[PDB]
Design a protein around this ligand. Structure first.
Ligand SMILES: Nc1ncnc2c1ncn2[C@@H]1O[C@H](COP(=O)(O)OP(=O)(O)O)[C@@H](O)[C@H]1O
Lengths: 360, 216, 72, 72, 72, 72, 72
């Protein structure tokens, strides 16, 4: 009886709001209500949407009670609920993945092997870790993000990225009480909306390059949105009824271990990722960097680079520990090859070699 | 009965045991009316869907054909043959034989009288009281009194059930669900639930109208 | 007639009030008033809360100061 | 902190803690007068807020790790 | 300390530490004045034991003497 | 009586300010209606614009709705 | 700027420049919240409105003369 009377209320408002004074709401509150009480999401969404019913039915232009109402409804009903992609739980799968995608140091692989070996043994009649979160410390160029992508592929989860070096206040990672448009939920709810399932691998970038410029240190919010026994029943200011971040993976990244917040230093297992050697960088280029440039710039069967030229570029055109400088050098090689191919190729497959690298 | 002519019903299914006029405007239905005039004033009424197709179709009909004994058949030159049909009971439709005019064979009435008729009469009295309250309060909602007067003094409980169900206004899917129920008590319970839902909506309307006049 | 109908439909919209859905809310800042009453607080807290509740209900739209008052 | 947890368990009241170290101003304990959106009180009010009882056992963490240069 | 590690890392009744190995960890693997270092070392032991047990369980009940600590 | 008469008279003033033809109260209003249509916008933009179009049919001395609606 | 104009000529597009020297607010860069008349949208939005093409060439001059402060 309650549901049918609310359905009648829906019908009357969707018949009436066509002539309503405030059109910024778009009179779509009833159209969007098809996920209020025709919802495939749990009781929390239903309770808030019952409360969201109060927030509807007003005007616009400056601090609307209805634009915030429909925005909160969309945020609540677009973040995935009870939908998990089928994850494969294997460590040997990761054994092959960390070989088919990276030359690798063969030292950082085993740390993730340890952590995943823990992750298979999820006991307690549930899934809860109470363990560190794969803090990765090293240069930017080094394949932190690619390591995360490979891990996510190994476990078949949607990898993401949300920078934390651009956060200065406890409002880009937290929310604000839903009463007006102009307030946005934190970057983590952003990432949760980007994915359509409840268990996405998430990365966190440059946590050590974050400061408390404004009033409020984002470190406490970081610790609260991440501690995998209190965040299972967590919302920021923007949301109201708890949303779990327990199933959600959290791998992290930084550059130094000094500016990482002291409260965040709890449940951190440092996985140190050093630079690379010249031979290792040469293999990386000849396997995954130079071919990347080749089919990025459009060189399917156009130019080939001898290993001598690759090592010469590495020993000359980049000294940074990462593989970003080498990547940019090879990309500019691709650009110059794109020209020296665009005024006519002397053959189907031109040849790049160490003799004329300074020409390219 | 079987292979009897079929007249699609207008905008809703005509429930049995109710004094209702049925419009016949299309010539395809007129031919079936003429053929039904050759079947001893007996028509196996099979209704078509919600907003109708201009011509009867061998796929848009319903699965329940009501057998009606025509009280009178008055003819008009305006373009519509309004027939006054007083039906008996529902019956199932096996399949569809295309026309036009359409044909459909059925069986005996699906209305049955089960055991424990004391509960049947108790539910009949309760539903009669509920519908009397429903109609009496629904004067601002434009419920007629001739509808309330046409349900008093009935012998068959199915007659009372269908007559009250027609006189109460809701969609067509719920009427189809009621006609599907061959149980004598299940139909009464469904009508009671629908009347309760409509009366709750009426109470909400009264409360909001009181709020409106208070605001005035 | 258009103005009369517009006023009538505004009144009907206010009446909806959400009923059972509106049991918590009552046009907004009412549930808050009741929860002020429900929580046993020092009388100074009660007076300040009532004073700034009166300061509320002032067209939150176009006035974020009403939002900060609601935050208080 | 585990000693504090044991003490709270013996007293049978819900433990809590707040990392008051690394706070460089008086503003993070008293907040500031509300005049904009994002008006936030001090750490202690947060602690008492997330502990829904009026008699918790709060552990002032790292009370000797504060600095005082500005904002009180 | 160790039982909590093992109960968390999914290895109860499937690994053991001859507490001479605990003495070895304390005397070589942690010089801090508390147990957080010891709890981190035992956490690493738990995770690596889980990894080794994940390459094929060679026993129904494990054991770790003092010698093979710089292997787990 | 005087206020009713004043509303009546001002409303014929509104009903004679329709530029005589009565196509629209203000030319700017009918210009935006076609300008929205005569520009090929995506379904996310055109559909919404067709609904904030309803904020029009206002004039300067009346509702200030069109004052910012025309600018938008 | 003349190199930008020459590239626009060669590319057969519409050159257009928006100065970014001394900008601190997002309201200066992009739109500000829809307060009615007043608080007009920002620089780059006006630049996009000026050209009648959806694929223009925009020269962001003195882009290194910006500033980051409050209000966006
Ligand atoms: N074993 C490896 N070590 C370093 N880089 C690798 C390796 N294998 C592949 N790469 C490539 O190096 C690039 C590193 O760039 P990127 O992932 O952008 O660094 P980050 O994201 O950490 O700043 C990746 O695009 C990746 O494809």
């Amino acid at each position: 009886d309650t549901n049918q009377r609310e359905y009648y209320l829906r019908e009357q408002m969707k018949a009436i709001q066509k002539e309503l004074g405030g059109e910024d709401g778009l009179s779509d509150l009833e159209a969007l209500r098809k996920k209020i009480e025709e919802v495939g999401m749990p009781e929390a969404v239903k309770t808030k949407a019952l409360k969201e019913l109060d927030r509807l039915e007003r005007m616009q232009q400056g601090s609307p009670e209805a634009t915030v109402a429909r925005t909160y409804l969309d945020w609540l009903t677009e973040v995935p609920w009870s939908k998990a992609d089928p994850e494969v739980l294997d460590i040997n799968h990761t054994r092959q993945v960390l070989d088919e995608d990276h030359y690798g140091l063969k030292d950082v692989k085993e740390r993730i092997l340890e952590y995943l070996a823990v992750r298979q043994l999820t006991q307690g009649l549930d899934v809860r870790n109470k363990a560190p979160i794969l803090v990765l410390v090293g240069p930017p160029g080094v394949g932190k993000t690619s390591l995360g992508r490979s891990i996510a592929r190994s476990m078949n989860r949607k990898f993401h990225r949300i920078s934390l070096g651009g956060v200065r206040d406890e409002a880009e990672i937290r929310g604000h009480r839903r009463t007006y448009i102009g307030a946005m939920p934190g970057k983590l709810i952003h990432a949760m909306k980007q994915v359509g399932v409840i268990n996405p691998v998430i990365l966190l970038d440059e946590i050590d390059k974050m400061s408390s410029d404004w009033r409020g240190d984002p470190a406490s919010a970081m610790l609260e949105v991440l501690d995998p026994e209190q965040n299972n029943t967590f919302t920021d200011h923007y949301l109201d009824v708890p949303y779990d971040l327990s199933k959600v993976f959290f791998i992290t990244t930084a550059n130094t271990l000094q500016t990482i917040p002291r409260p965040l230093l709890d449940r951190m297992e440092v996985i140190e990722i050093p630079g690379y050697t010249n031979m290792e960088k040469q293999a990386i280029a000849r396997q995954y960097l130079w071919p990347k440039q080749v089919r990025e710039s459009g060189m399917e069967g156009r130019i080939e680079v001898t290993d001598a030229a690759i090592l010469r570029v590495i020993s000359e055109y980049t000294r940074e520990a990462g593989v970003r400088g080498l990547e940019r050098e090879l990309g500019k090689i691709a650009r110059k090859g794109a020209k020296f191919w665009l005024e006519g190729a002397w053959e189907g497959l031109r040849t790049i070699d160490a003799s004329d690298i300074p020409t390219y | 009965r079987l292979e009897l002519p079929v007249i699609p019903l207008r905008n809703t299914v005509i429930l049995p045991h109710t004094t209702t006029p049925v419009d016949v405007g299309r010539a395809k239905s007129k031919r079936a009316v003429e053929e039904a005039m050759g079947a001893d004033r007996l028509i196996f009424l099979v209704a078509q869907r919600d907003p109708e197709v201009d011509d009867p179709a061998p796929d848009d009909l319903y699965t329940w054909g009501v057998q009606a004994v025509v009280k009178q058949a008055m003819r008009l030159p305006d373009g519509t043959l309004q027939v006054m049909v007083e039906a008996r009971a529902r019956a199932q439709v096996t399949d569809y034989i295309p026309g036009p005019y359409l044909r459909a064979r059925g069986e005996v009435f699906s209305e049955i009288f089960p055991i424990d008729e004391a509960v049947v009469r108790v539910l009949v009295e309760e539903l009669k009281e509920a519908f009397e309250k429903y109609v009496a309060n629904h004067k601002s909602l434009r419920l007629d009194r001739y509808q309330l007067e046409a349900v008093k003094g009935t012998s068959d409980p199915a007659m009372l059930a269908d007559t009250i169900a027609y006189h109460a206004t809701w969609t067509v899917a719920e009427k189809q669900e009621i006609l599907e129920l061959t149980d004598l008590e299940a139909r009464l319970k469904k009508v009671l639930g629908l009347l309760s839902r409509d009366l709750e909506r009426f109470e909400l309307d009264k409360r909001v109208a009181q709020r409106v006049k208070e605001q005035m």
